[PDB]
């Protein structure tokens, strides 16, 4: 009825689960997270009043290292949402084989009619409120929904200010803007990492993508992003495009560059010039070879499952595909790209930002792409080649390959003892 995220998180987790062999203690271990901190954030309105607002903190699990994950400032933002992605998140980074775990925050707030005043102050009331349980070696936010570098600078600040300097204050929070302890290629990080999947899974397909057509399904930074690097690297064609207004089709091929500055221009990509408006619900079985959906979730279901034609789907988004949609899809012989794989590349980017702080010395554009590279390339063939080893669904590969990570390093530090 509610369909509560944590229920099905914690649902997908056991059916990831009874695809291998873990012991009943460990899977009751991950269905609860280890750390939940709900705190109260006061702030002095502009008027003069003072308003308080719920923060959460939750830490799901800490066995790999330090737990990460962004902050939500969402007026429809709960608890039992900020679990799950916690949960989500430590999957995330067991994957890409980051030493991280499971973290994630939010306070539930409007911060569109929050002045600068006042969210600078949300930030710094945030951070005294949480200081107990976050630092460089116990938890590191990150920029989410709603949230900005700008918002990451004022938090680290905060908190540099707390920690009166006793040590990488840099690094205890990622995101932040280039001249405070930021990183090159941050801003395109999470396309980055989806390109190279994709580029992977064409090489597992045997399929050149120099020349072909992809379509990406909502056009924010993930998916501008990722439509120009399949342009520019990928030597595809960008034929249709998309946000929640409609969405665009052009065989002949769309500007990315153009599409972008229309959008910015009218506020939406609709009646682009020279071009076939159409709307998500036949964008998604426009027949493409890789079909990147980088909008809001759920926009695959038994309904237009059996109508995809896209030879790659590639997740760029959190969970845009149904397990009804899966089962569909994987019967059709369509190679589907996890969505806490292909998305991986901005987690992968914030742990090197959080290694240059901890370590004082940065890297350039070209060693950050390379290490993700690197990074991405060798998560996504784990992950294959236990998809071809086990015969199961790419998503329960990536599940099994996270989950396995997380017992093992658990079982080392004696956690569980079976
Ligand atoms: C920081 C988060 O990353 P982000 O940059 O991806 O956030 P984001 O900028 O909010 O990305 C959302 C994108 O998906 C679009 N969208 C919202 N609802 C949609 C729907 N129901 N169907 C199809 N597209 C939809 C948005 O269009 P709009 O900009 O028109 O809302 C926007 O293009
Ligand atoms: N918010 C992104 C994906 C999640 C992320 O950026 O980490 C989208 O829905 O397009």
Known sequence: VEIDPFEMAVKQLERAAQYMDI????????????????????????????????????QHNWARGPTKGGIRWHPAETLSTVKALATWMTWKVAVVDLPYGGGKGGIIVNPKELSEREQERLARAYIRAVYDVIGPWTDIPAPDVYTNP??????????????????????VITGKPLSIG????????????????IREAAKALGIDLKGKKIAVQGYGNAGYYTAKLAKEQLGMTVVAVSDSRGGIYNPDGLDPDEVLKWKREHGSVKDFPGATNITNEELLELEVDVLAPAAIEEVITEKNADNIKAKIVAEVANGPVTPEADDILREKGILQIPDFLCNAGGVTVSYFEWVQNINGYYWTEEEVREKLDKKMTKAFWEVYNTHKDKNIHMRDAAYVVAVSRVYQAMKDRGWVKK
Do not use: C
């Open 150 to 171: 700008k918002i990451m600078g004022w938090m680290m600040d905060e908190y540099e200010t707390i920690m009166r300097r006793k040590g990488p204050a840099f690094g």
């Open 182 to 197: 930021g990183s090159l290629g941050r801003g395109t990080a999470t396309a980055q990492g989806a390109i190279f999947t």
């Open 23 to 58: 012991s009943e203690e460990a899977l009751e271990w991950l269905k609860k997270p280890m750390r939940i901190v709900e705190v109260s954030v006061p702030i002095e309105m502009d008027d003069g009043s003072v308003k308080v607002f719920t923060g959460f903190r939750v």
